[PDB]
Design a protein around this ligand. Structure first.
Ligand SMILES: Cc1cc(OCCCc2c3n(c4c(-c5c(C)nn(C)c5C)cccc24)CCCN(Cc2cccc(C(=O)O)c2)C3=O)cc(C)c1Cl
Length: 150
């Protein structure tokens, strides 16, 4: 499964970049072109979604009661509940990743930067295993970037 690897890489780099603030060096593996502008798409749109959804994001974060990695292994079930209810679109998916970034910035504050990698993997696993076929019909991240062009 490569869609898992491509998605995980995009989600990881965006979350860590949000958490840290550095636009990261390093090679963007393979198929980097689509992944590069989805990440660039996430920079432009995802952070604004966080601004537009700040109240419930702060509320959700306060109720989740995140402290360590053993909390992360329980966030998936709440993620699966809030996310999988309804019909699929890219707005839901960019919202999913946006709150992951919100959680990532919080995790750094409480000095829990090592937990950003499970989160992104939990996010990635929740997305593909529930939206795989749809992501294939939408041509994956190509249809993502095509959707969010400016
Ligand atoms: C990383 C992580 C992520 C998690 O979940 C990510 C799911 C994304 C998400 C959604 N919602 C969220 C809320 C929220 C709000 C807003 N109000 N209330 C009451 C709540 C609960 C708070 C947080 C996240 C979400 C509510 C409605 C917005 N949609 C559907 C939708 C449909 C159509 C158009 C749009 C559009 O805006 O374009 C959006 C969501 O799927 C969970 C965990 C545990 C973790 Cl650790």
């Amino acid at each position: 499964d490569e869609l898992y690897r491509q998605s995980l890489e995009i989600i990881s780099r965006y979350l860590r970049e949000q958490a840290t603030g550095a636009k990261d060096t390093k090679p963007m593996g393979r198929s980097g072109a689509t992944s590069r502008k989805a990440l660039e798409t996430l920079r432009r749109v995802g952070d604004g979604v966080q601004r537009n959804h700040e109240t419930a994001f702060q509320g959700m974060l306060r109720k989740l009661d995140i402290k360590n990695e053993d909390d992360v292994k329980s966030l998936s079930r709440v993620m699966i509940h809030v996310f999988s209810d309804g019909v699929t679109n890219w707005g839901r998916i960019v919202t999913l990743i946006s709150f992951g970034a919100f959680v990532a910035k919080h995790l750094k504050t409480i000095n829990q930067e090592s937990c950003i990698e499970p989160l992104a993997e939990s996010i990635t696993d929740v997305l593909v295993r529930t939206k795989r076929d749809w992501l294939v019909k939408q041509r994956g991240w190509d249809g993502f970037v095509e959707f969010f062009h400016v």
